[PDB]
Amino acid sequence: AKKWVTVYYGVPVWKEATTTLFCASDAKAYDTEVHNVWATHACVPTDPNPQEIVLGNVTENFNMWKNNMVEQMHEDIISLWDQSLKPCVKLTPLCVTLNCNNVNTNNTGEMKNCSFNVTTSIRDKIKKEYALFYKLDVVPLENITNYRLINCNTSVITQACPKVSFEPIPIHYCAPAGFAILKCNSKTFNGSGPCTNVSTVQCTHGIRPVVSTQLLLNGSLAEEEIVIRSENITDNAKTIIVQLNEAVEINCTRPNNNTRKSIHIGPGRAFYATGDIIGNIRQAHCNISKARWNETLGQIVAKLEEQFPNKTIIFNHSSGGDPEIVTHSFNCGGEFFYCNTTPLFNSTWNNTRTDDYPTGGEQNITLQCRIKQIINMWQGVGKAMYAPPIRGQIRCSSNITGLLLTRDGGRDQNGTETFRPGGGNMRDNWRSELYKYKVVKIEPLGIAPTACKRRV
Amino acid sequence: RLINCNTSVITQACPKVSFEPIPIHYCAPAGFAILKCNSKTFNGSGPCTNV
Amino acid sequence: LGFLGAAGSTMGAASQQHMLQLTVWGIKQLQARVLAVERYLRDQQLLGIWGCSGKIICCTNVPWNDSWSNKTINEIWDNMTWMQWEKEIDNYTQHIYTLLEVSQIQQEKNEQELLELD
Amino acid sequence: LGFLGAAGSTMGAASQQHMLQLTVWGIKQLQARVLAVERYLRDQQLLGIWGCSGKIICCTNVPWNDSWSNKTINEIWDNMTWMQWEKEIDNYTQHIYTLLEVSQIQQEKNEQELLELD
Amino acid sequence: LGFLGAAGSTMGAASQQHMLQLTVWGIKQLQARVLAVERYLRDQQLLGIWGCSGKIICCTNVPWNDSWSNKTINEIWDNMTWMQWEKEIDNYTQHIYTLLEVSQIQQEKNEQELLELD
Numbered sequence A: 001a002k003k004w005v006t007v008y009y010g011v012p013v014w015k016e017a018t019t020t021l022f023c024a025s026d027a028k029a030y031d032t033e034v035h036n037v038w039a040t041h042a043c044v045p046t047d048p049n050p051q052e053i054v055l056g057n058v059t060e061n062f063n064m065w066k067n068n069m070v071e072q073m074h075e076d077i078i079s080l081w082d083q084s085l086k087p088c089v090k091l092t093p094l095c096v097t098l099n100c101n102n103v104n105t106n107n108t109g110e111m112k113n114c115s116f117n118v119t120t121s122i123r124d125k126i127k128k129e130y131a132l133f134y135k136l137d138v139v140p141l142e143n144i145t146n147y148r149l150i151n152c153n154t155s156v157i158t159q160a161c162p163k164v165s166f167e168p169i170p171i172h173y174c175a176p177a178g179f180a181i182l183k184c185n186s187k188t189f190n191g192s193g194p195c196t197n198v199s200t201v202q203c204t205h206g207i208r209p210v211v212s213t214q215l216l217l218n219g220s221l222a223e224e225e226i227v228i229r230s231e232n233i234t235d236n237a238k239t240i241i242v243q244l245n246e247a248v249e250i251n252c253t254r255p256n257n258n259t260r261k262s263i264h265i266g267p268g269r270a271f272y273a274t275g276d277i278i279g280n281i282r283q284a285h286c287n288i289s290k291a292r293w294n295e296t297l298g299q300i301v302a303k304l305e306e307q308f309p310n311k312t313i314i315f316n317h318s319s320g321g322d323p324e325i326v327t328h329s330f331n332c333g334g335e336f337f338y339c340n341t342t343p344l345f346n347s348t349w350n351n352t353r354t355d356d357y358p359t360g361g362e363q364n365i366t367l368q369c370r371i372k373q374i375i376n377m378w379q380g381v382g383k384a385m386y387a388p389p390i391r392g393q394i395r396c397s398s399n400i401t402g403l404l405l406t407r408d409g410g411r412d413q414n415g416t417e418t419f420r421p422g423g424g425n426m427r428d429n430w431r432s433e434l435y436k437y438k439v440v441k442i443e444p445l446g447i448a449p450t451a452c453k454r455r456v
Numbered sequence B: 001r002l003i004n005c006n007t008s009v010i011t012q013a014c015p016k017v018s019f020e021p022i023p024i025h026y027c028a029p030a031g032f033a034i035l036k037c038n039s040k041t042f043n044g045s046g047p048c049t050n051v
Numbered sequence C, D, E: 001l002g003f004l005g006a007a008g009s010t011m012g013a014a015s016q017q018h019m020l021q022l023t024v025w026g027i028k029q030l031q032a033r034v035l036a037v038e039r040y041l042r043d044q045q046l047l048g049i050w051g052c053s054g055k056i057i058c059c060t061n062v063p064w065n066d067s068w069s070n071k072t073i074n075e076i077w078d079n080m081t082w083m084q085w086e087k088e089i090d091n092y093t094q095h096i097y098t099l100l101e102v103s104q105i106q107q108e109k110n111e112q113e114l115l116e117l118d
């Protein structure tokens, strides 16, 4: 009887929001005063006791591709890649006419010995210089083969500095005071559904910005089952993200002992070319295992045969394209590898068995990589980047944990469905790690009726 | 040739831009303070008794 | 983050030093600090004008109108779990703020002054 | 802007979510937000040390000195329209602030402690 | 800077308008203003949850545990000069904050509500 209004502060009510998230690294690095590219000067040191409150009976709803954290991360990686290579050497005087000949080992030619006139640091004299550089960095201009460099029609081209690292150190994401991040703890949770086990954090997982296509390398694993996510799986234009539960290890390398020149063009600006090769000239193979990947490809299809439950399903390779689109492209120590995956997406799966892999051969499926110096990742139309050569030998040892697929057409050929590795966006790499996070907003002020009143 | 045009990019300072050393005071924000030594004969790296 | 631990319980059961550089991680940290200080001060500014300045439980002198809700006290303090109660009275809240602003403070301060001249 | 509606009445008759970009309209908005938060907190900081922390009408224990003004209570509460009264005592205001700071709070807190040991 | 004048006395004897330009002296001034406003609000936020919101001397209901210190009242109020007393109990301070947060406010607000229903 005789209710009265009463005001409370500190009441657990949240709503949905969209805010600014900031980095948080830790102090297991940051002993040397170096500046790589993912700044980590300005990242706040994370706490050695991160708190996770386990919520009660809450049934919050999530989405895997209506997430705004992905759109922030995709713009925080492009922008942070332009702080560096802003105070660096433009290569506008290199857009000249190049003479050449070929190195004495063909198809292993993939190197070219080039000569060019340069206007030196003193603007009156003409110098003549030599450099070895790869095919896929040239365009034939029109007998003497007389060509020029790949990307002088359409872009300004910038040499990255050495002593500037590319090693993908982890990034946490924190939300400011008065906000929180919700986290899903379900074991096999698809995209876009309700949940029953939800927790709250201030600070996300250790996400590593591995720039990669066709395969997801130093990533995170599922638990007890391989899980397939898609937006609308009956439609073909939506990409398919496959997440594994046991990682498949891969061992790339580049055997060469190449050197580096130092051509000085302009005042205080040195251009680091490739010199000579000391020893033999070889390929750049990678060697994924065979009996270990057979099981993985055979238990992807046990989940694929449920969504399309009559037809036989096959795996076909990609279609033509630029070499940076249709091949597995990644970064290792400072070079950029471009291996093709036709030995992987090869087979035909009738009843979760195949005839395409014999067992009459050997293990260790090989892949032919290829090197490229001029790289225009993220498809900027007027910007490129020249990665200077690393001297010595290169090894990777990556740790494959998932992949990207897309379907082909809707034409009824047979009871046959072709999958092709073709996920055509950079955001798909970072939806694979941010699928279980959602940013909310705390509203701590509440109104309720009870039987208490003021006095005078 | 000129002294430094193979190692550096060189920039003319403008005229009507002064070089005169006018004094600078350093102020601390609110919540902070600056202490000051008032000893007549004080070396480096020691204590004080007039602050 | 001491809140949110009773987010599923019922309503009665819950009874460093770095120079500012304008780079891409500095702008975000500065924006986060300004957001935090503003979002604290608007809640303190609302609590100040209701006479509830330094408290977490504050009774008032505004009678509860049944057009806002018709339920019973032990019906809502034993079943309803604050998210649902906030979704229920979400239409009537701003009006209630005005009744807290006038009819419990403007009539309390002036009349208090009329007692002080004795 | 609920104030200023009685700016001519006598003294007694008045009884969104955008990334911070450092462009030419972003700098102005950030400067405006910092100005607003500072200008609120200096007035709350003055009211805090006078014992008038969460009130809009606050009586004190400082007697009124006739060197400040010689007028009568009903002479100034019925004719004077706050702009003019603020222009009248503008020379004496800072001194009065000091008398509110000491002689109503420093003598009130310490003596209150002398009553609490009983 | 009205503090610090009794920094050596014993504990009982102490009873303009410029457009924001992002140049090298503008960034420092903006960082100084944000530091000042944050460092004020964290101390006011600590005082608010202890029931000591607008006071400079505030008594509580937490008994003094002798594991914190074994000394006498007139032994520490007559000899010790706040820097030394702060260096003495520096290990036990955070725990004491928690006892001010619960056992003097959480038990005071709820029980106050139990008196208001009469």
Ligand SMILES: *[C@@H]1O[C@H](CO)[C@@H](O[C@@H]2O[C@H](CO)[C@@H](O[C@@H]3O[C@H](CO)[C@@H](O)[C@H](O)[C@@H]3O)[C@H](O)[C@H]2NC(C)=O)[C@H](O)[C@H]1NC(C)=O
Pocket: A097, A098, A099, A115, A116, A117
């Ligand atoms: C870089 O600049 C030099 C500048 O000298 C270019 O050298 C040019 O080389 C050609 C080939 O030797 C010269 O051609 C000459 O033609 C006459 C007539 O047929 C023939 O009798 C000579 O034996 C000789 O072949 C040419 O005069 C010479 N100079 C110029 C100004 O063209 C060089 O080709 C340039 N390199 C590049 C990559 O642009």
Ligand SMILES: *[C@@H]1O[C@H](CO)[C@@H](O[C@@H]2O[C@H](CO)[C@@H](O[C@@H]3O[C@H](CO)[C@@H](O)[C@H](O)[C@@H]3O)[C@H](O)[C@H]2NC(C)=O)[C@H](O)[C@H]1NC(C)=O
Pocket: A343, A346, A356, A357, A358, A360, A361, A362, A363, A365
């Ligand atoms: C699918 O990819 C596989 C690679 O995993 C391709 O299989 C490879 O086929 C060649 C030639 O058919 C095999 O070489 C042969 O091995 C036998 C037995 O050792 C030997 O008698 C032959 O002289 C020749 O050396 C090769 O071993 C095999 N790869 C592996 C790893 O076993 C296959 O061609 C691809 N395409 C299709 C449609 O299957």
Ligand SMILES: *[C@@H]1O[C@H](CO)[C@@H](O[C@@H]2O[C@H](CO)[C@@H](O)[C@H](O)[C@H]2NC(C)=O)[C@H](O)[C@H]1NC(C)=O
Pocket: A103, A113, A114, A130, A132, A275, A276, A277
């Ligand atoms: C690329 O071609 C140039 C052609 O000049 C080679 O440079 C010369 O190589 C010979 C053989 O060792 C040396 O005697 C000369 O001193 C080199 N310089 C010049 C200016 O003639 C260069 O070695 C070739 N590189 C490769 C990998 O074939």
Ligand SMILES: *[C@@H]1O[C@H](CO)[C@@H](O[C@@H]2O[C@H](CO)[C@@H](O)[C@H](O)[C@H]2NC(C)=O)[C@H](O)[C@H]1NC(C)=O
Pocket: A190, A191, A192, A193, A194, A230, A231, A232
């Ligand atoms: C992810 O799984 C959830 C199940 O937890 C799906 O949600 C159901 O979807 C069906 C068909 O669209 C509806 O009839 C149900 O009402 C949904 N809810 C429940 C609780 O069953 C969701 O559709 C799945 N998402 C995708 C993309 O497949």
Ligand SMILES: *[C@@H]1O[C@H](CO)[C@@H](O[C@@H]2O[C@H](CO)[C@@H](O)[C@H](O)[C@H]2NC(C)=O)[C@H](O)[C@H]1NC(C)=O
Pocket: A253, A283, A285, A286, A287, A364, A366
């Ligand atoms: C990768 O696996 C291959 C086996 O297919 C290893 O063997 C050599 O690979 C090169 C590359 O084509 C061939 O030219 C050689 O003839 C192969 N030799 C033999 C004996 O098969 C290769 O050594 C492996 N590399 C690593 C680093 O494990």
Ligand SMILES: *[C@@H]1O[C@H](CO)[C@@H](O[C@@H]2O[C@H](CO)[C@@H](O)[C@H](O)[C@H]2NC(C)=O)[C@H](O)[C@H]1NC(C)=O
Pocket: A314, A316, A317, A319
């Ligand atoms: C993978 O796709 C390609 C086309 O992208 C298929 O190649 C065609 O194969 C048929 C069968 O003989 C030919 O008639 C066509 O001329 C081929 N090319 C094109 C462009 O259609 C290839 O068969 C597919 N792989 C599998 C295993 O079916």
Ligand SMILES: *[C@@H]1O[C@H](CO)[C@@H](O[C@@H]2O[C@H](CO)[C@@H](O)[C@H](O)[C@H]2NC(C)=O)[C@H](O)[C@H]1NC(C)=O
Pocket: A340, A341, A342, A343, A368
């Ligand atoms: C991917 O690598 C494979 C390596 O086996 C290439 O497949 C063959 O390459 C040879 C090169 O001499 C061709 O003659 C064959 O026609 C190719 N196909 C087969 C079935 O043997 C394949 O071309 C490579 N793909 C790309 C895009 O480079």
Ligand SMILES: *[C@@H]1O[C@H](CO)[C@@H](O[C@@H]2O[C@H](CO)[C@@H](O)[C@H](O)[C@H]2NC(C)=O)[C@H](O)[C@H]1NC(C)=O
Pocket: B043, B044, B045, B046, B047
């Ligand atoms: C500056 O003078 C002071 C004297 O007040 C020196 O301090 C003493 O130095 C001696 C010898 O190094 C030590 O044994 C003492 O412990 C120091 N302290 C005191 C309080 O006596 C100080 O070393 C001098 N510094 C320099 C650079 O000469």
Ligand SMILES: *[C@@H]1O[C@H](CO)[C@@H](O)[C@H](O)[C@H]1NC(C)=O
Pocket: A055, A056, A057, C008, C009
């Ligand atoms: C959740 O639900 C269970 C059963 O309905 C109940 O016993 C429990 O108190 C609820 N709250 C929490 C925080 O577990």
Ligand SMILES: *[C@@H]1O[C@H](CO)[C@@H](O)[C@H](O)[C@H]1NC(C)=O
Pocket: A141, A153
């Ligand atoms: C680049 O320019 C050359 C001539 O300089 C031309 O032949 C070639 O087609 C151009 N490439 C593109 C993609 O425009």
Ligand SMILES: *[C@@H]1O[C@H](CO)[C@@H](O)[C@H](O)[C@H]1NC(C)=O
Pocket: A185, A197, A198
């Ligand atoms: C929810 O997830 C947390 C994560 O550790 C786990 O401890 C808890 O047992 C889970 N609850 C249920 C009901 O599975």
Ligand SMILES: *[C@@H]1O[C@H](CO)[C@@H](O)[C@H](O)[C@H]1NC(C)=O
Pocket: A232, A233, A234, A235
């Ligand atoms: C998914 O794709 C199919 C095939 O185009 C379409 O008919 C359907 O409307 C889409 N959406 C849903 C929610 O199924």
Ligand SMILES: *[C@@H]1O[C@H](CO)[C@@H](O)[C@H](O)[C@H]1NC(C)=O
Pocket: A257, A278
């Ligand atoms: C590569 O060449 C350098 C040349 O100085 C030599 O010292 C080094 O041992 C070589 N490395 C290998 C693996 O042969």
Ligand SMILES: *[C@@H]1O[C@H](CO)[C@@H](O)[C@H](O)[C@H]1NC(C)=O
Pocket: A309, A310
């Ligand atoms: C394939 O489709 C037919 C109906 O056309 C159905 O009888 C059969 O069960 C389906 N196969 C499977 C494995 O479900």
Ligand SMILES: *[C@@H]1O[C@H](CO)[C@@H](O)[C@H](O)[C@H]1NC(C)=O
Pocket: A350, A351
């Ligand atoms: C697929 O497997 C079935 C047995 O389930 C077999 O009869 C058939 O020949 C195989 N191949 C095709 C193309 O259906």
Ligand SMILES: *[C@@H]1O[C@H](CO)[C@@H](O)[C@H](O)[C@H]1NC(C)=O
Pocket: A290, A291, A294, A295, A298, A353, A354, A357, A358, A359
């Ligand atoms: C691939 O897996 C199938 C199914 O277990 C097996 O029959 C076949 O021998 C495997 N291939 C190799 C090379 O082990």
